[PDB]
Design an enzyme around this catalytic site. Structure first.
Site, mmCIF file in Angstrom:
data_model
loop_
_atom_site.group_PDB
_atom_site.id
_atom_site.type_symbol
_atom_site.label_atom_id
_atom_site.label_comp_id
_atom_site.label_asym_id
_atom_site.label_seq_id
_atom_site.Cartn_x
_atom_site.Cartn_y
_atom_site.Cartn_z
ATOM 1 N N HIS A 1 5.735 11.565 6.650
ATOM 2 C CA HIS A 1 5.644 11.212 8.127
ATOM 3 C C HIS A 1 6.947 10.667 8.629
ATOM 4 C CE1 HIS A 1 0.946 10.564 7.901
ATOM 5 N NE2 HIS A 1 1.317 11.873 8.023
ATOM 6 N N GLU B 1 -2.775 13.677 4.245
ATOM 7 C CA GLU B 1 -3.703 13.103 5.239
ATOM 8 C C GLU B 1 -4.269 14.222 6.073
ATOM 9 O OE1 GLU B 1 -3.313 8.738 5.634
ATOM 10 O OE2 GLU B 1 -1.720 9.454 7.001
ATOM 11 N N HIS C 1 7.976 7.745 5.816
ATOM 12 C CA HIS C 1 7.244 7.350 4.605
ATOM 13 C C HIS C 1 6.346 8.465 4.136
ATOM 14 C CE1 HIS C 1 4.523 6.403 8.031
ATOM 15 N NE2 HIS C 1 3.632 6.965 7.221
ATOM 16 N N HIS D 1 0.811 -1.246 0.000
ATOM 17 C CA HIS D 1 0.000 0.000 0.000
ATOM 18 C C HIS D 1 0.837 1.285 0.000
ATOM 19 C CE1 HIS D 1 0.866 0.632 4.336
ATOM 20 N NE2 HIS D 1 0.834 -0.755 4.363
ATOM 21 N N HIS E 1 2.383 9.710 2.125
ATOM 22 C CA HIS E 1 1.071 9.367 1.620
ATOM 23 C C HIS E 1 0.795 10.262 0.468
ATOM 24 C CE1 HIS E 1 -0.165 7.209 5.332
ATOM 25 N NE2 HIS E 1 0.857 8.004 5.801
ATOM 26 N N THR F 1 -2.498 6.294 11.294
ATOM 27 C CA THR F 1 -3.514 6.597 10.276
ATOM 28 C C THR F 1 -3.954 5.416 9.392
ATOM 29 O OG1 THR F 1 -1.955 7.399 8.547
ATOM 30 C CG2 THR F 1 -2.680 8.949 10.165
HETATM 31 N N1 LIG Z 1 0.809 7.052 8.807
HETATM 32 S S1 LIG Z 1 1.345 6.807 10.407
HETATM 33 O O1 LIG Z 1 0.216 7.009 11.350
HETATM 34 O O2 LIG Z 1 2.448 7.847 10.669
HETATM 35 C C1 LIG Z 1 2.037 5.193 10.763
HETATM 36 C C2 LIG Z 1 3.331 5.069 11.297
HETATM 37 C C3 LIG Z 1 3.829 3.786 11.589
HETATM 38 C C4 LIG Z 1 3.000 2.664 11.394
HETATM 39 S S2 LIG Z 1 3.590 0.983 11.778
HETATM 40 C C5 LIG Z 1 2.680 0.511 13.294
HETATM 41 C C6 LIG Z 1 2.339 -0.982 13.286
HETATM 42 O O3 LIG Z 1 2.327 -1.413 14.620
HETATM 43 C C7 LIG Z 1 1.700 2.828 10.870
HETATM 44 C C8 LIG Z 1 1.204 4.109 10.556
HETATM 45 ZN ZN LIG Z 2 1.806 7.848 7.624
#
Ligand SMILES: NS(=O)(=O)c1ccc(SCCO)cc1
Ligand SMILES: [Zn+2]
Length: 256
Positions: free
Chosen positions: A115, A102, A90, A60, A92, A195
Protein backbone atom coordinates in the site's frame (compact mmCIF):
# COMPACT_ATOMS: atom_id res chain seq x y z
CA UNK A 1 -6.73 -3.47 18.58
CA UNK A 2 -4.79 -6.07 16.65
CA UNK A 3 -5.16 -9.08 14.36
CA UNK A 4 -5.39 -11.86 16.97
CA UNK A 5 -8.58 -13.63 17.94
CA UNK A 6 -9.48 -11.32 20.83
CA UNK A 7 -8.58 -7.91 19.43
CA UNK A 8 -8.79 -8.67 15.71
CA UNK A 9 -10.94 -7.73 12.72
CA UNK A 10 -14.08 -9.65 13.71
CA UNK A 11 -14.07 -7.62 16.98
CA UNK A 12 -13.16 -4.07 15.77
CA UNK A 13 -16.71 -2.80 15.55
CA UNK A 14 -17.09 -2.84 19.41
CA UNK A 15 -14.67 0.14 19.63
CA UNK A 16 -14.95 1.46 16.02
CA UNK A 17 -18.58 1.19 14.87
CA UNK A 18 -17.59 2.42 11.37
CA UNK A 19 -16.22 -1.21 10.87
CA UNK A 20 -19.77 -2.05 9.73
CA UNK A 21 -20.16 1.04 7.52
CA UNK A 22 -21.07 1.33 3.85
CA UNK A 23 -17.59 2.12 2.54
CA UNK A 24 -15.27 -0.39 4.30
CA UNK A 25 -12.10 -1.85 2.74
CA UNK A 26 -10.71 -4.07 1.52
CA UNK A 27 -13.14 -5.70 -0.93
CA UNK A 28 -13.31 -8.62 -3.36
CA UNK A 29 -13.18 -7.14 -6.83
CA UNK A 30 -15.58 -9.12 -9.09
CA UNK A 31 -14.37 -8.32 -12.59
CA UNK A 32 -17.72 -9.31 -14.28
CA UNK A 33 -19.31 -6.58 -12.10
CA UNK A 34 -16.79 -3.72 -12.72
CA UNK A 35 -17.65 -0.78 -14.87
CA UNK A 36 -15.25 0.38 -17.56
CA UNK A 37 -15.08 4.13 -17.26
CA UNK A 38 -13.49 6.29 -19.99
CA UNK A 39 -13.33 9.56 -18.00
CA UNK A 40 -10.51 7.96 -15.81
CA UNK A 41 -7.12 9.32 -16.71
CA UNK A 42 -3.91 7.29 -16.29
CA UNK A 43 -2.26 7.34 -12.82
CA UNK A 44 0.83 9.55 -12.67
CA UNK A 45 3.33 9.12 -9.80
CA UNK A 46 6.39 11.37 -9.35
CA UNK A 47 8.26 10.73 -6.09
CA UNK A 48 11.57 12.31 -5.04
CA UNK A 49 13.83 9.76 -3.23
CA UNK A 50 15.08 12.59 -0.91
CA UNK A 51 11.61 12.52 0.80
CA UNK A 52 12.19 8.97 2.21
CA UNK A 53 12.56 9.50 6.04
CA UNK A 54 12.25 6.58 8.46
CA UNK A 55 11.22 2.94 8.89
CA UNK A 56 9.20 2.00 12.02
CA UNK A 57 8.06 -1.19 13.66
CA UNK A 58 4.51 -0.47 14.79
CA UNK A 59 3.81 -3.82 16.49
CA UNK A 60 1.23 -5.16 13.98
CA UNK A 61 3.29 -4.16 10.91
CA UNK A 62 6.08 -1.82 9.83
CA UNK A 63 5.85 1.53 7.95
CA UNK A 64 8.24 3.55 5.76
CA UNK A 65 7.45 7.24 6.26
CA UNK A 66 8.18 10.16 3.94
CA UNK A 67 8.68 13.90 4.54
CA UNK A 68 5.44 15.54 3.49
CA UNK A 69 5.99 19.26 3.97
CA UNK A 70 5.72 20.02 0.25
CA UNK A 71 4.76 18.54 -3.12
CA UNK A 72 8.09 16.87 -3.97
CA UNK A 73 6.40 13.44 -4.07
CA UNK A 74 2.94 13.26 -5.54
CA UNK A 75 0.16 11.13 -7.13
CA UNK A 76 -2.13 12.68 -9.79
CA UNK A 77 -4.56 11.53 -12.55
CA UNK A 78 -6.79 8.51 -12.31
CA UNK A 79 -10.15 9.61 -10.72
CA UNK A 80 -8.52 12.61 -9.10
CA UNK A 81 -8.53 16.28 -9.91
CA UNK A 82 -6.42 17.13 -6.84
CA UNK A 83 -2.72 16.30 -6.31
CA UNK A 84 -2.03 13.83 -3.43
CA UNK A 85 1.15 13.91 -1.39
CA UNK A 86 3.04 10.63 -0.52
CA UNK A 87 3.30 9.96 3.21
CA UNK A 88 3.99 6.27 3.79
CA UNK A 89 4.20 2.80 2.28
CA UNK A 90 3.73 -0.61 3.95
CA UNK A 91 2.73 -4.25 3.36
CA UNK A 92 0.11 -6.74 4.61
CA UNK A 93 0.77 -10.43 4.67
CA UNK A 94 -0.59 -13.75 5.96
CA UNK A 95 0.64 -16.69 8.03
CA UNK A 96 1.27 -18.83 4.94
CA UNK A 97 1.78 -18.14 1.24
CA UNK A 98 -1.88 -19.04 0.52
CA UNK A 99 -3.40 -15.77 1.73
CA UNK A 100 -2.20 -12.45 3.05
CA UNK A 101 -3.34 -9.79 0.55
CA UNK A 102 -6.26 -7.56 1.69
CA UNK A 103 -7.99 -7.04 -1.61
CA UNK A 104 -8.91 -10.21 -3.59
CA UNK A 105 -9.78 -10.45 -7.29
CA UNK A 106 -12.63 -12.91 -8.21
CA UNK A 107 -12.10 -14.63 -4.86
CA UNK A 108 -8.39 -15.16 -5.48
CA UNK A 109 -6.16 -14.33 -2.40
CA UNK A 110 -2.53 -13.25 -3.03
CA UNK A 111 0.37 -13.77 -0.62
CA UNK A 112 0.76 -10.07 0.36
CA UNK A 113 -0.19 -6.52 -0.71
CA UNK A 114 1.75 -3.28 -0.97
CA UNK A 115 0.00 0.00 0.00
CA UNK A 116 1.37 3.40 -1.00
CA UNK A 117 -0.66 6.07 0.89
CA UNK A 118 -1.08 9.78 0.09
CA UNK A 119 -3.15 12.71 1.39
CA UNK A 120 -4.96 15.55 -0.42
CA UNK A 121 -2.66 18.59 -0.20
CA UNK A 122 -4.97 20.59 -2.54
CA UNK A 123 -7.74 20.71 -0.06
CA UNK A 124 -5.98 20.12 3.30
CA UNK A 125 -2.76 21.21 4.90
CA UNK A 126 -1.76 18.16 6.95
CA UNK A 127 -2.26 14.40 7.10
CA UNK A 128 -4.05 14.84 10.41
CA UNK A 129 -6.56 17.21 8.82
CA UNK A 130 -7.00 15.04 5.67
CA UNK A 131 -7.27 11.64 7.27
CA UNK A 132 -10.94 11.65 8.32
CA UNK A 133 -12.26 13.56 5.17
CA UNK A 134 -14.09 11.65 2.41
CA UNK A 135 -11.70 13.01 -0.25
CA UNK A 136 -8.66 13.12 2.05
CA UNK A 137 -6.59 9.99 1.25
CA UNK A 138 -5.55 8.04 -1.88
CA UNK A 139 -3.91 4.58 -1.48
CA UNK A 140 -2.41 2.48 -4.34
CA UNK A 141 -2.71 -1.24 -3.64
CA UNK A 142 -0.51 -3.78 -5.45
CA UNK A 143 -1.19 -7.50 -5.10
CA UNK A 144 1.97 -9.52 -4.42
CA UNK A 145 2.11 -13.00 -5.84
CA UNK A 146 4.47 -15.68 -4.44
CA UNK A 147 7.11 -16.64 -7.04
CA UNK A 148 10.53 -15.32 -7.98
CA UNK A 149 12.44 -13.10 -5.56
CA UNK A 150 11.74 -9.44 -6.15
CA UNK A 151 15.00 -7.59 -6.09
CA UNK A 152 13.27 -4.17 -5.86
CA UNK A 153 12.30 -5.11 -2.28
CA UNK A 154 16.00 -5.26 -1.23
CA UNK A 155 16.58 -1.97 0.57
CA UNK A 156 13.32 -2.54 2.53
CA UNK A 157 14.12 -6.10 3.56
CA UNK A 158 17.77 -5.21 4.42
CA UNK A 159 16.35 -2.46 6.77
CA UNK A 160 14.26 -4.78 8.92
CA UNK A 161 17.23 -6.08 10.99
CA UNK A 162 17.39 -2.57 12.61
CA UNK A 163 13.74 -2.49 13.58
CA UNK A 164 13.12 -6.04 14.76
CA UNK A 165 10.99 -5.19 17.75
CA UNK A 166 8.03 -2.96 18.47
CA UNK A 167 8.78 0.71 18.43
CA UNK A 168 12.21 0.50 16.95
CA UNK A 169 12.79 3.09 14.19
CA UNK A 170 15.70 4.03 11.96
CA UNK A 171 16.43 6.38 9.14
CA UNK A 172 15.41 5.08 5.75
CA UNK A 173 16.55 7.46 3.09
CA UNK A 174 17.04 8.08 -0.67
CA UNK A 175 14.30 5.72 -1.90
CA UNK A 176 11.66 6.12 -4.56
CA UNK A 177 8.81 3.66 -3.98
CA UNK A 178 7.47 3.95 -7.50
CA UNK A 179 10.28 1.37 -8.18
CA UNK A 180 8.01 -1.17 -6.38
CA UNK A 181 4.95 -0.57 -8.62
CA UNK A 182 4.25 -2.98 -11.51
CA UNK A 183 5.29 -1.82 -15.03
CA UNK A 184 1.62 -1.30 -16.05
CA UNK A 185 -0.48 1.04 -13.94
CA UNK A 186 -3.89 -0.11 -15.25
CA UNK A 187 -6.20 -0.02 -12.24
CA UNK A 188 -9.49 -0.44 -10.49
CA UNK A 189 -10.82 2.26 -8.24
CA UNK A 190 -13.58 2.50 -5.62
CA UNK A 191 -14.42 4.67 -2.59
CA UNK A 192 -13.40 2.97 0.63
CA UNK A 193 -11.62 3.17 3.98
CA UNK A 194 -8.49 2.59 5.95
CA UNK A 195 -8.18 -1.13 6.45
CA UNK A 196 -7.38 -0.99 10.17
CA UNK A 197 -8.62 1.23 13.06
CA UNK A 198 -9.67 3.94 13.00
CA UNK A 199 -11.18 2.63 9.73
CA UNK A 200 -12.10 6.12 8.41
CA UNK A 201 -14.05 6.15 5.14
CA UNK A 202 -11.59 8.58 3.62
CA UNK A 203 -9.72 6.49 1.03
CA UNK A 204 -10.06 6.46 -2.73
CA UNK A 205 -8.47 3.11 -3.65
CA UNK A 206 -6.30 2.52 -6.75
CA UNK A 207 -5.74 -1.22 -7.09
CA UNK A 208 -3.24 -2.25 -9.83
CA UNK A 209 -4.42 -5.02 -12.05
CA UNK A 210 -0.89 -6.40 -12.53
CA UNK A 211 0.75 -8.08 -9.53
CA UNK A 212 4.42 -7.87 -8.53
CA UNK A 213 6.35 -10.88 -7.29
CA UNK A 214 7.73 -11.77 -3.87
CA UNK A 215 9.52 -14.99 -2.82
CA UNK A 216 8.46 -17.38 -0.03
CA UNK A 217 11.80 -16.42 1.73
CA UNK A 218 11.08 -12.73 1.25
CA UNK A 219 7.63 -13.22 2.91
CA UNK A 220 9.40 -15.07 5.71
CA UNK A 221 11.40 -11.88 6.43
CA UNK A 222 8.17 -9.99 7.03
CA UNK A 223 6.84 -12.75 9.26
CA UNK A 224 10.02 -12.81 11.36
CA UNK A 225 9.47 -9.15 12.44
CA UNK A 226 8.52 -9.19 16.11
CA UNK A 227 5.43 -7.57 17.68
CA UNK A 228 6.87 -7.58 21.34
CA UNK A 229 9.29 -4.92 22.67
CA UNK A 230 13.01 -5.66 23.13
CA UNK A 231 13.80 -8.11 25.96
CA UNK A 232 10.37 -9.70 25.90
CA UNK A 233 9.59 -13.26 24.58
CA UNK A 234 9.37 -13.19 20.79
CA UNK A 235 5.87 -12.88 19.25
CA UNK A 236 6.42 -12.97 15.41
CA UNK A 237 4.19 -10.80 13.19
CA UNK A 238 2.51 -13.72 11.43
CA UNK A 239 -0.28 -11.77 9.69
CA UNK A 240 -2.03 -8.45 9.38
CA UNK A 241 -4.65 -8.56 6.67
CA UNK A 242 -8.25 -7.64 7.19
CA UNK A 243 -10.97 -9.85 5.59
CA UNK A 244 -12.76 -8.44 2.58
CA UNK A 245 -15.84 -6.35 3.33
CA UNK A 246 -19.26 -6.06 1.65
CA UNK A 247 -19.56 -3.65 -1.33
CA UNK A 248 -22.92 -2.24 -0.07
CA UNK A 249 -23.78 -1.14 -3.55
CA UNK A 250 -20.56 0.58 -4.42
CA UNK A 251 -19.27 0.38 -7.97
CA UNK A 252 -15.74 -0.66 -8.73
CA UNK A 253 -14.49 1.18 -11.80
CA UNK A 254 -11.87 -0.19 -14.24
CA UNK A 255 -9.43 1.95 -16.06
CA UNK A 256 -8.99 -0.73 -18.72
N1 LIG B 1 -3.86 -0.33 5.11
S1 LIG B 1 -4.29 1.29 4.80
O1 LIG B 1 -5.77 1.41 4.71
O2 LIG B 1 -3.66 1.66 3.45
C1 LIG B 1 -3.74 2.49 6.00
C2 LIG B 1 -2.96 3.60 5.61
C3 LIG B 1 -2.57 4.54 6.58
C4 LIG B 1 -3.01 4.38 7.90
S2 LIG B 1 -2.55 5.58 9.19
C5 LIG B 1 -4.09 6.51 9.54
C6 LIG B 1 -4.19 6.87 11.02
O3 LIG B 1 -4.90 8.08 11.10
C7 LIG B 1 -3.80 3.27 8.26
C8 LIG B 1 -4.18 2.31 7.30
ZN1 LIG C 1 -2.48 -1.07 4.36
Amino acid sequence: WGYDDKNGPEQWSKLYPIANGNNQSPVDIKTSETKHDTSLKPISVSYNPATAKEIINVGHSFHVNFEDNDNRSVLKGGPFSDSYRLFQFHFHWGSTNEHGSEHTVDGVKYSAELHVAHWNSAKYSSLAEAASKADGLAVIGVLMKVGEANPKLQKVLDALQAIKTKGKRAPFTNFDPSTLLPSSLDFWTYPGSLTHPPLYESVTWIICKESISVSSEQLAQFRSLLSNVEGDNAVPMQHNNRPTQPLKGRTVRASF
